[PDB]
């Protein structure tokens, strides 16, 4: 039994853009979730529908780890029942979410002195995402009555915006890395267990 590759998710060199959030399937391993919940370096650690101190007792078919970067002020949107540009247009948790939301300030990794333009989020969308939906499209968004038909213009917008993270930003405008753990139980051998 390998120990689960949590370092792979949490210590990855670069994170996904929130609009193109990464998902990793975890399987066939032992998870000491204590490595996460006993860490003092996470600024957000919130579990819905389950206590993280009970996870070491349990077995799952698979564990999913979604990861991305957003700004500090937006971490609040990564929870059931939220609204705003992130929850509505980028990463949506369902109302009946069971899992953990873990975040930490990543200014030292992700901000860059001239601005990191490489982290993006969707600013405009026709409708809200469904829970766990991912939209990587890049069609021009019609904000007014006249159609754009593929052409950028006034009230005809490119749908994404760049964060521009700089180390001198206020903390709410600094980058945070986020991992969301969800749990899948199926009719199969449980491939992910704690020490039980």
């Amino acid at each position: 039994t390998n120990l689960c590759p949590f370092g792979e998710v949490f210590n990855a060199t670069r994170f996904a853009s929130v609009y193109a959030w990464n998902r990793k399937r975890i399987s066939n391993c032992v998870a000491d979730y204590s490595v996460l919940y006993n860490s003092a370096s996470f600024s957000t650690f919130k579990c819905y529908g389950v206590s993280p101190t009970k996870l070491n007792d349990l077995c799952f078919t698979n564990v999913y780890a979604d990861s991305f970067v957003i700004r500090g002020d937006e971490v609040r949107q990564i929870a059931p029942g939220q609204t705003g540009k992130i929850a509505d247009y980028n990463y949506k948790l369902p109302d009946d979410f069971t899992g953990c939301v873990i975040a930490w300030n990543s200014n030292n990794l992700d901000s860059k002195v001239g601005g990191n333009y490489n982290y993006l989020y969707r600013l405009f969308r026709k409708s809200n995402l469904k829970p766990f939906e991912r939209d990587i499209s890049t069609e021009i968004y019609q904000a007014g009555s006249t159609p754009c038909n593929g052409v950028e213009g006034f009230n005809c917008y490119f749908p994404l915006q760049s964060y521009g993270f700089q180390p001198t930003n206020g903390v709410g405008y600094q980058p945070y890395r986020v991992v969301v753990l969800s749990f899948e139980l199926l009719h199969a051998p449980a491939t992910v267990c704690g020490p039980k």
Partner: antibody, heavy 128, light 111 residues
Framework: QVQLVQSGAEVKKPGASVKVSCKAS????????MHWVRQAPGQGLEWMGT????????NYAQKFQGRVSMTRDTSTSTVYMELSSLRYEDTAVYYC?????????????????????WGQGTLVTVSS | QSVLTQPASVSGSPGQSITISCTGT?????????VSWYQQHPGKAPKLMIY???DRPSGVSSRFSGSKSGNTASLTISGLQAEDEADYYC??????????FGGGTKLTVLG
């Protein structure tokens, strides 16, 4: 978008009862607890109690125990507050409020939510 | 589990900082960190400003902050603006497993 739509204003004689509805839409009704908060005209907010629609559990302020009944109909995503043996001092705007989901912290301790959405209020006047 | 005590009124001038206190007991404000603050404008439902003593929900300006010491929680509004004129209510969990509001504070923006 989350909407909580309450029943219309009511007038009741002392000793009567009132049943106020709160119809939820735009979210999974059974995932969030609902609370009832009331406010007499020109006075403060007063918490009355809560119902958890997923298990039908309720918890009421001692003051209303034995006289309030909160119920839920999952088939219509509606919460109800029935307040019996009304008196003048029950004259108030009654609001339903959704409690945002609570969570467990790192150490396994439970943290409640907070009121994230509100109904429009229902004025109930108790008068002879 | 008895209405928490708040000053009836506070007033400040635009740009100033004001603080609203909320004094309960060891059974509520002093017993837990589950203190919220709600803002209420005339004719409107209350609106969450602060939860868990000091956290803001999304959309609430950082001009709003909260703290607590012993049996007393405090809401502070910095950079006071005309639109902050409203009633403010503290709200706490209690050892009875119930929730209780403070009596409320009317905030006047002077000048």
């Amino acid at each position: 978008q989350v909407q909580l739509v309450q029943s219309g204003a009511e007038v009741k004689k002392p000793g009567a009862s009132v049943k106020v509805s709160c119809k939820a839409s735009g979210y999974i009704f059974t995932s969030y607890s609902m609370h009832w908060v009331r406010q007499a005209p020109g006075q403060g907010l007063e918490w009355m109690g809560t119902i958890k629609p997923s298990d039908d559990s309720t918890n009421y302020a001692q003051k209303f125990q034995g006289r309030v009944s909160m119920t839920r109909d999952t088939s219509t995503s509606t919460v109800y507050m029935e307040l019996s043996s009304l008196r003048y001092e029950d004259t108030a705007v009654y609001y339903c409020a959704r409690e945002a989901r609570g969570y467990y912290d790192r150490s396994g301790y439970y943290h409640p939510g907070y009121f994230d959405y509100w109904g429009q209020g229902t004025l109930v006047t108790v008068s002879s | 589990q008895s209405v928490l005590t708040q000053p009836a009124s506070v007033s400040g001038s635009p740009g100033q900082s004001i603080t609203i206190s909320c004094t309960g007991t060891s059974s509520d404000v002093g017993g837990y960190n589950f203190v919220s603050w709600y803002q209420q404008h005339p004719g409107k439902a209350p609106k969450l400003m602060i939860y868990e003593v000091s956290d803001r929900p999304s959309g609430v300006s950082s001009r709003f902050s909260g703290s607590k010491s012993g049996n007393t929680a405090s809401l502070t509004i910095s950079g006071l603006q005309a639109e902050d004129e409203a009633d403010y209510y503290c709200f706490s969990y209690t050892t009875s497993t119930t929730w209780v509001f403070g009596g409320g504070t009317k905030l006047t923006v002077l000048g």
